[PDB]
Structure formats: C-alpha cells, structure tokens
Amino acid sequence: MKIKPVKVESIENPKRFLNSRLLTKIEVEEAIEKALKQLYINIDYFGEEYPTPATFNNIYKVMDNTEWTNGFWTGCLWLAYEYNQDKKLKNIAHKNVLSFLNRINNRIALDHHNLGFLYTPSCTAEYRINGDVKALEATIKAADKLMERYQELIIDCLLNIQLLFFAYEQTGDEKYRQVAVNHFYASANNVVRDDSSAFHTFSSWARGQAWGIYGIPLSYRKMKDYQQIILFKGMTNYFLNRLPEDKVSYWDLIFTDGSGQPRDTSATATAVCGIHEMLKYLPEVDPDKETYKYAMHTMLRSLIEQYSNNELIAGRPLLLHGVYSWHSGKGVDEGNIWGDYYYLEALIRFYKDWELYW
C-alpha cells in the first residue's frame, strides 16, 4: 500500500534549534532524580490505586483502574525502575500489572479504543524488563481484543497498533502483522491532512500531531517503508514551524506567543520521544537530521527547565501545563499522566540505550 503525497514544509529558521546547547548527562540525570522524588512521594499517596487522567489545581485525585490513562502511571514506575532498579518500584508496578490482567479478564471499563496505551506501558513494559509471564498474558489478551475490534480511525491508533506488532513477534502469527500494517496505511492516508497536519478522527491539535510524530517511527521500526520517513518529516516540520519561542507547543498549533492560550506540554514530550526514535534510523545524509537532533534537545531542555514540577508534595505531576480536553474543559492547564509518562520516557531515552516497551 502507498502513502498519499504530503507537503513537507521546510524547517523555518533552523538556527533556532541548531544554535542551542545539547543537554548534558548531569542535567538529564538531575531531571530524572527530581521526577523520581515526586514518583516516590506519589507511590505512598496512590498506593495500589491510580492518578486521574489530569490534575486538579495541579494535584491528581486518586482513582481505580477504570480510565484510558491508567497504564501511563505504571509506565512512570517502570521507567523509574530502568533508572535505579529499585525492587519497591517493581513490586508496586507488578501489582498494577495484576490489576490490568484482572481488568482484561473481566472486561472492566474497556470501552476505550487505545488498548495499546493501557497495556503497553504497564504489561508489555514488565515483559520487556523481566519476562514476567502474567504481563505477557495480559498483553496477548489485549492484542486479541484489539484484533476482534478491528474486524467487528484515530491518529493515536498509530501507537495502538504497536501492541499488534508485539503479538506478531511473540507468536509468529502473521495475522497480527497484517492487521497492524493495514491499519497503519489507512490511518496515515486518512487522519493526516495534505499539509501534514492532523485531526483526531476520520486548526491543529498539538497532541494529535505528536501522536503522528511518534506513531510513525514506531511503525517504521516494524515496516521499514521509506515513505514513513517522508510522512514523519511532513508532520514533524509542521510541528516545529508552529512552536513558540520556548519551543513548547501551545495546545493547538494555531496559537503561539501572546495568544494567552494554555500550553500542552504533553504534546511536546511525545514529539521529543518521536524525534528521538526516528533519528535512530534517519540517514546521516538527511540535511535536516542534525536540525532534528538539536530540536528535540531544545524542546526537552525547556520542559526540564521551565515546565517540570518543582513542588515536591503529594499528588503533584511530573510535568506542568498540559491540556487534556479544551472543548470539554477537562485538565486545562493541568498536569496529566501521559505527559508525565512521555516526559520521563524522553529523559530515559536521552540517558540510556532504552529498550522500548512499544
């Protein structure tokens, strides 16, 4: 299958990225340590329960395993575990995994399309880390449910399908791969506009753009279609060209400095992960490769220096100033758990050779 032509905008004023300082080991390390201090605080606060999708006045409420976002909390714990190998983290995160197994076994609150977001950073993550068999079981069950739904289109489905590529690799069953590949091309052609912008379902919502920026290289790993690199370039350049002075996306990329509109830091964290991933594969002769490298550094630096949480009290997020849903008035200028997750994932990506949960 083919990818429709898209307009790849030239990266405007590339020196805005190229003239910046790369992040040092100590800077990233200190950001990770600050994040983990908050996580350890929140461990005692949440116990075996979960943060709400977004904070309220920058304090998460405590909820059970029933939203679309619970996996991102366990994801934070596993990422912390990547850094310090603390058995305490493993023990809590594994209890979450058992809860996720229970959730899929008993079909509890699973009327959410992105089973990938729920099971990948929680269950597939533990499997990646230590081969836990119940984490594997939950993941395969999640994958099977997704397969059933894809026979009985949203941009974040580009991350959703990673669960299918995993199932293909684990079982050898080609059907997982076929559905994954088919859904990729259908999403790419439909949910991405000709100017390389995006909408949610089939102005430019920043997180939707970032889902594409990360979803595409994730899929590229498993498909190796060069037109995916072109599409990544289209979507990424569109994003970078609409970043404000501090390089942190406003919630909608039609807004910039002086708009008075809230930022969405979660979109920027996700884009940093996406660019980091794509750079593993992008040819050295790509004239924009170095610009991308510096871009992701400048974006992540701003998140660390200007947006990361500095108040270490119960319920605080890792990262401030996200937007959950502007139109519903939910989590507007609030921390959110996926933003926390991708922020920490970006830090871990920069710090170590990280084995992807995705």
Which residue range is the domain that position 281 belongs to?
1-358
CA-closest candidate to residue 40, choices 80, 83, 97: 80
Which tokens in the block code for residue 285?
């002769």
Q: Say if residues 138 and 163 touch (Cβ distance below 8 Å).
A: no
Residue whose entry in the numeric block shows the structure tokens 């940093």: 272
CA dist., res. 275 & res. 258, Å (int): 27
Q: Say if residues 240 and 202 touch (Cβ distance below 8 Å).
A: no
CA-closest candidate to residue 249, choices 259, 258, 240, 237: 240
CA dist., res. 321 & res. 253, Å (int): 15
Which tokens in the block code for residue 91?
């023990």
Q: Which residues have C-beta within 8 Å of that of residue 36, sequence separation ≥ 6?
A: 80, 83, 84
C-alpha angle 207-211-217 in degrees, rounded to nearest 5: 145
CA dist., res. 51 & res. 314, Å (int): 11
Residue 89 has φ and ψ, to the nearest 5°, of -60, -50
By CB atoms closer than 10 A (0-12, 13-18, 19+), residue 283 is exposed
Helices (H), the chain: 15-18, 25-46, 70-84, 87-105, 115-119, 125-130, 133-149, 157-160, 162-171, 174-191, 206-223, 226-241, 265-279, 289-302, 337-351
CA dist., res. 122 & res. 114, Å (int): 13
CATH code for position 336: 1.50.10.10
CA dist., res. 355 & res. 313, Å (int): 31
CA dist., res. 279 & res. 336, Å (int): 27
Number of structural domains the chain divides into:
1
